[PDB]
Amino acid sequence: GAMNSSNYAELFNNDIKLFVDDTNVYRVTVHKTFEGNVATKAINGCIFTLNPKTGHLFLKIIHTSVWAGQKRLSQLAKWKTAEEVSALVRSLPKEEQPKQIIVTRKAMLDPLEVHMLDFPNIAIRPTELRLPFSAAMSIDKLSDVVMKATEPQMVLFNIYDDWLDRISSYTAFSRLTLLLRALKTNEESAKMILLSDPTITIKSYHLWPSFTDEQWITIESQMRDLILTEYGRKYNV
Amino acid sequence: MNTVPFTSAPIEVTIGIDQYSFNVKENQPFHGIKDIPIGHVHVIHFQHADNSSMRYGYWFDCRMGNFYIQYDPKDGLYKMMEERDGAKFENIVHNFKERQMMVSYPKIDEDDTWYNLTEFVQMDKIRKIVRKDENQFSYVDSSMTTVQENELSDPAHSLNYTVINFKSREAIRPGHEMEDFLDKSYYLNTVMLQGIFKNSSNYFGELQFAFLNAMFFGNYGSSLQWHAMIELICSSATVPKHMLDKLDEILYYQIKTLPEQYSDILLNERVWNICLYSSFQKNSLHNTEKIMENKYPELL
Ligand SMILES: COC(=O)[C@@H]1NCCc2cc(O)ccc21
Numbered sequence A: 001g002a003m004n005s006s007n008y009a010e011l012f013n014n015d016i017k018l019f020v021d022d023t024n025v026y027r028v029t030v031h032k033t034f035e036g037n038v039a040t041k042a043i044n045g046c047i048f049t050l051n052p053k054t055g056h057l058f059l060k061i062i063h064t065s066v067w068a069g070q071k072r073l074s075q076l077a078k079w080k081t082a083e084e085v086s087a088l089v090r091s092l093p094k095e096e097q098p099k100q101i102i103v104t105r106k107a108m109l110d111p112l113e114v115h116m117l118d119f120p121n122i123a124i125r126p127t128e129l130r131l132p133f134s135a136a137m138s139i140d141k142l143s144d145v146v147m148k149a150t151e152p153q154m155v156l157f158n159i160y161d162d163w164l165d166r167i168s169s170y171t172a173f174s175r176l177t178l179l180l181r182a183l184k185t186n187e188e189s190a191k192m193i194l195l196s197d198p199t200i201t202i203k204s205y206h207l208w209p210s211f212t213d214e215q216w217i218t219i220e221s222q223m224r225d226l227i228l229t230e231y232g233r234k235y236n237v
Numbered sequence B: 001m002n003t004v005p006f007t008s009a010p011i012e013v014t015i016g017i018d019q020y021s022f023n024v025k026e027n028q029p030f031h032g033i034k035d036i037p038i039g040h041v042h043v044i045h046f047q048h049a050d051n052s053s054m055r056y057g058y059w060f061d062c063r064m065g066n067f068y069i070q071y072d073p074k075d076g077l078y079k080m081m082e083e084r085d086g087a088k089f090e091n092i093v094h095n096f097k098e099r100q101m102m103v104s105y106p107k108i109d110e111d112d113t114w115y116n117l118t119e120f121v122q123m124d125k126i127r128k129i130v131r132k133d134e135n136q137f138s139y140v141d142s143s144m145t146t147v148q149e150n151e152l153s154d155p156a157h158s159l160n161y162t163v164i165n166f167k168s169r170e171a172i173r174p175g176h177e178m179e180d181f182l183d184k185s186y187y188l189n190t191v192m193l194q195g196i197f198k199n200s201s202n203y204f205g206e207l208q209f210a211f212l213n214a215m216f217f218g219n220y221g222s223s224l225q226w227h228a229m230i231e232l233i234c235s236s237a238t239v240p241k242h243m244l245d246k247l248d249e250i251l252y253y254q255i256k257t258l259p260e261q262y263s264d265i266l267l268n269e270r271v272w273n274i275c276l277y278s279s280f281q282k283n284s285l286h287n288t289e290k291i292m293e294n295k296y297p298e299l300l
């Protein structure tokens, strides 16, 4: 059924599973028209489909042309997400297909269930975890590929860089969610924490900086402090 | 006008005939029901006084044979049987009619209620939902499960209603996922009407039979079928105008007849609120909406 903190280790077992987050599929800027009405302008978006055990990220870039002449875009976006996740599953070899797909938002359940009727043995599940995957577009290299896209495109990343050489999947996911939560809460300060040190760099083939084990402990502590600091500012604590 | 005689009434029981009902005491000299209107199916139903768990009954048409009821003390129920000897049936009926041991089907002349509830219900279609081919009448009870219920257990005792499932490959054309899920017209018109039922009359007959079973026997599976068949029409953007107008009439009389005190267990709030206020057909069921709002405003 629903996925929560009681069954959290299930994410790192040997049953292939994917998280699907649709919060960056349909992205708009709101602006005034010449006549003083309000209009939206879409910008390119993306589906965030992540294997939390391996770090493999299937980033489907949603180019603004998919919305052209369509109505009810917020509704259509859920169905387009479902269509694309279904197409990804069909594209994978059988032994790579997931046994479970966990959607971050419950509004994705029916669209994905309906698109996956041909896969009755793939469980479609909600989660009670609040996961910060909306902040994926704060990762510079992910935002860059989305905004430069001129057509629909799938790009594959490992969102853990090379961390699984040194840490477990459970720990890698915890580091990822901490980084994304910090970027969601205060993007400027999070990026300052990650990139201000001039002796630390991001490898061409990575998303995050090349921190040593001890440097990651310091970074993780700084990210926790940021989150707590922002919580205090928010609630006046 | 036809007659269903009773050998005896050895156990105290509430007997229903269509929408009417009456109480018979243990060993009372009750010998059946006369003046049953020819031209309609009928249902004769039972709930034992000493065990209300016993709710069951028989659908029948007096045009298809002569039927009588006798208590079976081994199986503990009133059983319908068919009489093949016509002259005997008439002599036994006349004898009891002369001694005034029968209740009269109490139809008021102005009253079209039963016709309105059974307009599309035919015995031949009943006998395909309820499979017991050796009898011309059909037994139904409170606990019988539907085929769809059994997929989610004895198949011979099942209600073979047409399976309706909005999240099934039958309902959703590959490549038309959003279209077919948000607008069920394909499923209603091509799959169900043109494909399975052949016409709206058969669809409405099953809808009406499901409602009657749910209301007379307190059968849960029937109630799920009745609501599903309503929701399928209401959730379709393209429905023939004659079907919408006829559905409004069908539901009006169903809601009118439902016992007020059973509304909590016979009406699904989600389905009715969706159908009356959110669906494509939210403005197409004026008579049903008006009676629902005046009679069961709490549900809404
Ligand atoms: C002498 O038998 C009976 O009176 C018996 N109970 C009345 C009802 C009935 C009807 C029938 O067609 C055949 C038998 C019966």
Ligand SMILES: COC(=O)[C@@H]1NCCc2cc(O)ccc21
Residues within 6 Å of the ligand: B214, B215, B217, B218, B219, B220, B221, B223, B265, B266
């Ligand atoms: C139409 O179904 C029924 O009448 C069924 N009879 C048993 C009691 C019962 C209770 C409920 O809360 C809901 C349904 C039922």
